[PDB]
């Protein structure tokens, strides 16, 4: 499972944050699997049927409104019939108000649930029409609803591979030109941020390299002598803990491999990937962020 290099998403300035124009909060949430992210979107094909999409949105809203109206009318008729029955029986006004309040609260709940569905659809439509890369979705339920409903245009996954795909699909020269154009203008406040981002991007471009070096797939290990192995009177292992950290990383990778072979739902696999990322970050550096291992 691809991982990220601790020296970047935690560094100040965080090279990833500037290059990918993401706040540290969002980047760290993405890395440790806290919220999904929209990688790429074919906005054109959605625009070509944006009117048709709005039309189907309207008709589904009409259908939900229609079932809502059916329920409201049925319950209002039931309540009115109950009130007429109670009047015929000549019961006290206390019973009248009790039944009336019960029915009114039931209808308020029905309308509130209908408005729940309506605002859910409105959020879906807003986040669908008003959608672009680098967007976040904190709640998993909303993302599940999006993919189930509109799983055609935008592809979004949470994890290091997400960043890798985003950066490799991303281009540098266009952003460099846009930042240069912004700098050519004024507005010091945003101009300084533009200057910093342009500096980073120009360094990337001049380096002749690619940002893909910020997501690792194969960590190396130093020779054995550099981590000398020591035998005590009882032959105990008390040498540099480098062996301990490599043990942890290898053990967790093998657990990942075995688990993915066996098959299991997304929750366990994602948790396990997070644990692996934690171990690699610890090995490249202990105590950089969070509680150091002891």
């Amino acid at each position: 499972a691809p991982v990220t290099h601790i020296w970047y998403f935690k560094g100040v300035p965080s090279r990833l944050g500037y290059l990918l124009d993401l706040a540290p909060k969002d980047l760290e949430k993405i890395i440790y699997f806290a919220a999904y992210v929209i990688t790429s979107v074919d906005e054109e094909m959605r625009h070509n049927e944006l009117s048709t999409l709005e039309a189907e949105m309207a008709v589904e809203r009409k259908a939900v409104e229609d079932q809502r109206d059916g329920e409201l009318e049925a319950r209002a008729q039931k309540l009115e019939a109950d009130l007429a029955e109670l009047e015929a029986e000549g019961a006290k006004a206390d019973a009248r108000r009790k039944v009336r309040d019960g029915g009114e609260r039931e209808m308020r709940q029905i309308r509130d649930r209908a408005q729940r569905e309506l605002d859910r659809l409105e959020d879906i439509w807003s986040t669908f029409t008003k959608l672009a890369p680098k967007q976040l979705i904190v709640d998993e339920n909303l993302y599940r609803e999006l993919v189930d409903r509109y799983g055609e245009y935008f592809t979004g996954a949470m994890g290091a591979e997400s960043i890798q795909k985003l950066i490799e699909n991303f281009d540098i020269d266009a952003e460099a030109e846009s930042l240069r154009d912004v700098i050519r203008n004024g507005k010091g406040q945003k101009k300084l941020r533009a200057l910093k981002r342009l500096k980073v991007v120009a360094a990337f471009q001049q380096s002749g390299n690619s940002p893909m070096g910020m997501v690792l797939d194969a960590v190396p290990v130093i020779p054995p002598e550099l981590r000398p192995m020591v035998q005590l009177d009882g032959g105990r292992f008390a040498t540099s803990d480098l062996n301990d950290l490599y043990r942890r990383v290898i053990n967790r990778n093998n657990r990942l491999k075995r688990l993915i072979d066996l098959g299991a739902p997304e929750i366990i696999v994602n948790n396990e990937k997070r644990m692996l990322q934690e171990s690699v970050d610890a090995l490249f550096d202990n105590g950089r962020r969070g509680r150091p291992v002891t």
Partner: protein, 142 residues
């Protein structure tokens, strides 16, 4: 923006992820067992039934989907128990994440090879299997 933020504990992420769990009190779990049995049966018959070009391949598909849903739900149900059992045997120098991962591995190895067979609460069986798995993990860690 470039302001810094604090990190997040791994355990708390697990709690947030499992907060959606809702135990069934072991009563309806028998229905889930029946559903998964029917799902395996439908899958096996479909594998055998590859030859027949049935007009309705959607009934087997429906059984399979019901089985998969039931399996996922029952696996979700026992995360609270596995994390309780894992935390009950802490303090031995092994991070809680590794123990809980081992418990999940043991659970998936257990329930997917379990039958009610007019047996008792499956919770006892899961507790037993995950306890054995975590004990094995600790022993091999040394």
């Amino acid at each position: 923006l470039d302001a810094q933020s604090p990190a997040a504990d791994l355990v708390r992420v697990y709690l947030n992820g499992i907060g959606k769990t809702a135990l069934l009190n072991a009563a309806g779990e028998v229905e889930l067992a029946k559903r998964i049995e029917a799902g395996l049966y439908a899958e096996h018959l479909l594998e055998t039934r590859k030859r027949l070009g049935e007009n309705r391949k959607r009934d087997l598909a429906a059984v399979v989907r019901d089985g998969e849903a039931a399996r996922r739900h029952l696996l979700e149900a026992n995360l609270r128990l596995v994390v309780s059992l894992a935390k009950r045997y802490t303090g031995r120098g092994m991070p809680l994440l590794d123990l809980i991962q081992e418990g999940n591995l043991g659970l998936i190895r257990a329930m997917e090879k379990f039958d009610y067979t007019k047996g008792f609460k499956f919770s006892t069986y899961a507790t037993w299997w995950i306890r054995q798995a975590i004990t094995r993990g600790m022993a091999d860690q040394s």
